[PDB]
Amino acid sequence: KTMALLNILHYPDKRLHKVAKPVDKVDDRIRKLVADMAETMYAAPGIGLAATQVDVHERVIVIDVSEDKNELRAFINPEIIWSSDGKQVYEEGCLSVPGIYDEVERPDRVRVRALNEQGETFELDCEGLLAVCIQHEMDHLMGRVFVEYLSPLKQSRIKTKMKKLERAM
C-alpha cells in the first residue's frame, strides 16, 4: 500500500535557502500542512521538520523529540523572544542531508512564542534536545542548513557525499 507523503528536499538544492513567509491565517489548509508534515516526519523517520524542507515556504514547523512519538508540537510563525548567553554543542543530523552528522554550537536555552494549530498564541521555554531542535527547524525557515555552520572544507566534502547519495543502488 502506497502512502501520500511530502517530498523532502536534499542539500544542496537551492530551494532550501528560500526565506519562508509568515502564515497570516491558520486555516484548514495550514492544519493539513501540519498533518502532512507530521506524517512525513514520522515516516522519514525524524524528530522535526520545517515546511521549507518540503518546498512550502511558509513559517510552519513540527517537532516530536519524544522516544514514544507521543509529544508532537506544531509551531506557526515561531519567534525566539529570548536566548541564553550559555551555549551547548550537539551533534546534529538533518532530514535534508541524509547520512551526515556534525557538531553545531547553539544557545542552550530559548523561549519561543508561536501560534498553534488553532491560531492561539503560546510561549514555550526550550532546553536540551528541544532547544536544539527548535533552533535547527527555525534556521530552515530562514534558508539555513546546519552544514553552513561547518568549515568550507566540510561543506565541500558533504556536497560530494550528496552526489553519491543520488546514485545509491
Strand, helix or coil at 125? strand
Residue 136 marked as a ligand binder: yes
Nearer to Zn ion, 28 or 100 (CB): 100
Give bridge partners of residue 122 from the DSSP assignment: 114
- Dihedral sign of CA atoms 68, 124, 97, 90 in order: negative
**Which parts of 75-104 interact with Zn ion (CB under 5 A)?**
94
Minimum CB–partner distance for residue 65 and Zn ion (Å):
13
Rounded least distance, CB 140 to Zn ion, Å = 6
Question: Does residue 106 contact residue 132 with C-beta atoms inside 8 Å?
Answer: yes
137 noted as active-site residue: yes
Active-site residue identified among 120, 137, 148, 166: 137
Dist. CA 76–CA 119, nearest whole Å: 8
Which residue(s) pair with 92 in the sheet?
102
Q: Is 140 annotated as a binding residue?
A: yes
Chain contacts with Zn ion (rule: CB under 5 A): 94
Residue ranges of the annotated binding site are 94, 136, 140
* Active site (catalytic) residues: 137
Residue ranges of the annotated binding site for Fe cation are 94, 136, 140
